[PDB]
């Protein structure tokens, strides 16, 4: 008796099971209400019920166990967590809790937690003694997260160009700067697919705030990982809540020496949401940005770091420029002094239908010698010195024509000499 197991079951089988259990007509009923009635009827027989979810401690002291399939939205099937157990096990926002639950009695509206069985997918004896995320020693990117497929596919050209322009390692904090209508969607899809193919052990999390739902359901059915999104039909409060829950879960996972990867596509939208939810202080800067509005996105971005004791946190955010709004322009570069990695995309190259439209000149990675060998770094330096004199479109055409001849970049580097 698990909550996620009943959530994955279809509607027809749940209706059939409820009709066999002998309850009210479930055809004219919601799936969540059907599951609730089935759990009630199964607990009336004396059997136990189990559930799971991410903890969201409220300001009063209690909390609930949000579900991932609903993008951490307030649902009727949330498991109530008393503050006594929180104080007894030192629980915090983001801790994954899995234990026995019971249906609400007369006068209650949510399931109660009796005994916790597993904390953060581990024993509670290992979670009671742990080092906080704020005390971990940061470090630079040491492990190399190669994005090249290696299967010789035609779509691998984007990953090869990305590796030649800006290699990505564990704990990297980069930025994907690109004007609208440049190809950010396809680039993010390719990055997510390459991460899921090359490094399936890492925890991939794609955050899409204030996006077109069709794109949400497309990304959810395309990438092999977790997708937490919030369409534009929701207020900025839900955006802030989702961002906080995601970053808290990422911190709790990193605290257990896990490799978390966050592919953010709405850093600008997140900053707009934070500027909308912040109370007015009577002081407005140039472009309509509050003085204390960028602090929360600043911390959300800076949360990414590489841990020496174990694990890492990678955050790749895509910033929006040339959107016609001065607020986004002020945000983007305020954040430019940030992202230890900038991958610029050119609109002029995208208009020529030359995919990918990557600005190789302005791209780059700091401390790239820690992720590449000596000969590889020398070859990349020679390639950059050869590409720099040529124009952007000409350099992109040259790179595409030279990478189409071979499958691996090593052969291209060997033929360049």
The residues that touch ligand BEF, with contacts defined as CB under 6 A, are 180-181, 184-185, 320, 337
Q: Give the relative orientation of helices 236-254 and 267-277 as an angle to the nearest 10 degrees.
A: 120
The residues, any chain, with a CB within 8 Å of residue 337's CB and separated by 6 or more, are none
- Draw the binding track, 138-177, toward ligand ADP (x: CB under 6 A; -: no contact): --------------------x-------------------
The nearer residue to its own copies, 249 or 251, going by C-beta atoms, is: 251
State yes or no: residue 182 binds ligand ADP (CB under 6 A): yes
List, as own/partner pairs, every contact residues 235-239 make where C-beta atoms lie below 8 angstroms and the sequence separation is at least 24, other chains included. 236/272, 236/273, 236/274, 236/276, 236/277, 237/277, 238/73, 239/209, 239/210, 239/269, 239/270, 239/273
Q: Helix crossing, 326-334 with 267-277: angle to 10°?
A: 110
Q: Are 198 and 147 in contact (CB under 8 A)?
A: yes
Q: How far apart are the first and last CA of the chain?
A: 64
Q: Is 292 in the site for RNA (CB under 7 A)?
A: no
Give the one residue of 160, 173, 184, 269 binding Mg ion; rule: CB under 5 A. 184
Cβ atoms 275, 284 nearer than 8 A: no
Does residue 276 interact with its own copies by CB under 8 A? Answer: yes
Q: Tell me, what DSSP letter sits at residue 116?
A: E
- x/- site string to its own copies, residues 306 to 345, per CB under 8 A? x-------------x--xxxxx-xx-xxxxxx--x-x---
Q: Which of 41, 70, 185, 220 binds Mg ion (CB under 5 A)?
A: 185
Q: Which of 264, 268, 300 is nearest to 287 (CA)?
A: 268
**Residue from 90, 153, 217, 378 that binds its own copies (CB under 8 A)?**
217
**Interface with ligand ADP (CB under 6 A), residue from 186, 222, 291, 416:** 186
3 state DSSP class of 25: coil
132 binds, among RNA, its own copies, ligand BEF, none (CB under 5 to 8 A by kind): none
Residue numbers after which the chain is interrupted (C to N above 2.5 A) read none
C-beta of 333: minimal distance to its own copies in Å?
Answer: 2
- Candidates 1-9, 12-20, 31-39, 184-192; binding stretch for ligand ADP (CB under 6 A): 184-192
Q: Which does 283 bind (CB under 5 to 8 A by kind): ligand BEF, Mg ion, RNA, none?
A: RNA
257 belongs to the binding site for RNA (CB under 7 A): no
Indicate whether 351 belongs to the interface with its own copies (CB under 8 A).
yes
∠ Cα 58 114 102 (to 5°) = 90
Which backbone phi and psi does 53 adopt, to 5 degrees?
160, 170
Tell me the two tokens of residue 357.
């439209």
Please select the residue that binds its own copies; options are 7, 102, 256, 362, rule is CB under 8 A: 362
- 258 touches Mg ion (CB under 5 A): no
Please give the residue ranges that form the binding site for ligand ADP (CB under 6 A).
158, 178, 180-187, 355-356, 366-367
Please give the residue ranges that form the binding site for its own copies (CB under 8 A).
28, 129, 134, 137-140, 171, 173, 180-181, 185, 212-218, 231-233, 275-276, 280-292, 298-299, 302, 305-306, 320, 323-327, 329-330, 332-337, 340, 342, 351-353, 361-362, 364, 366, 381, 384-385, 388
């Amino acid at each position: 008796m698990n909550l996620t197991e009943l959530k994955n079951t279809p509607v027809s089988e749940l209706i059939t099971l409820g009709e066999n259990m002998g309850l009210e007509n479930l055809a004219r009923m919601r799936k969540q209400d059907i599951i609730f009635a089935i759990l009630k009827q199964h607990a009336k027989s004396g059997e136990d019920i189990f559930g799971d979810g991410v903890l969201e401690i409220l300001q009063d002291g209690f909390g609930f166990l949000r579900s991932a399939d609903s993008s951490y939205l307030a649902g009727p099937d949330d498991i109530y967590v008393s503050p006594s157990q929180i104080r007894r096990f030192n629980l915090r926002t983001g801790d994954t809790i899995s234990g026995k639950i019971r249906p609400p009695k007369e006068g209650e509206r949510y399931f109660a937690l009796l005994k916790v069985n597993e904390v953060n997918f581990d024993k509670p004896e290992n979670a009671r003694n742990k080092i906080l995320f704020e005390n971990l020693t940061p470090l630079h990117a040491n492990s190399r997260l190669r994005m090249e497929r290696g299967n010789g596919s035609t779509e691998d050209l984007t990953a090869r160009v990305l590796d030649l322009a800006s290699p990505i390692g564990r704990g990297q904090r980069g930025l994907i700067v690109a004007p609208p209508k440049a190809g950010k969607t396809m680039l993010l899809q390719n990055i997510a697919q390459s991460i899921a193919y090359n490094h399936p052990d890492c925890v991939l999390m794609v955050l899409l705030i204030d996006e077109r739902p069709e794109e949400v359901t497309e990304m959810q059915r395309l990438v092999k990982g977790e997708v937490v999104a919030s369409t534009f039909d929701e207020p900025a409060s839900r955006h802030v809540q989702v961002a906080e829950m995601v970053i808290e879960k990422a911190k709790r996972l990193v605290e257990h020496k896990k490799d978390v990867i966050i592919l953010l596509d709405s850093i600008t939208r997140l900053a707009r949401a934070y500027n909308t939810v912040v109370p007015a202080s009577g002081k407005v800067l140039t472009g309509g940005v509050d003085a204390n509005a960028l602090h929360r996105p600043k911390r959300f971005f800076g949360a990414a770091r590489n841990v020496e004791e174990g694990g890492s946190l990678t955050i790749i955010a895509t910033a929006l420029i040339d959107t016609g709004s001065k607020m986004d322009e002020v945000i983007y570069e305020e954040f430019k002094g940030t992202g230890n990695m900038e991958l610029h995309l050119s609109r002029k190259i995208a208009e020529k239908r030359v995919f990918p439209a990557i600005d190789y000149n302005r791209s780059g990675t700091r401390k790239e010698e820690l992720l590449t060998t000596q000969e590889e770094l020398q070859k990349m330096w020679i390639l950059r010195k050869i590409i720099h004199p040529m124009g952007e479109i000409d350099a992109m055409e040259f790179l595409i024509n030279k990478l189409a001849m071979t499958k691996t970049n090593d052969d291209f580097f060997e033929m360049m000499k």
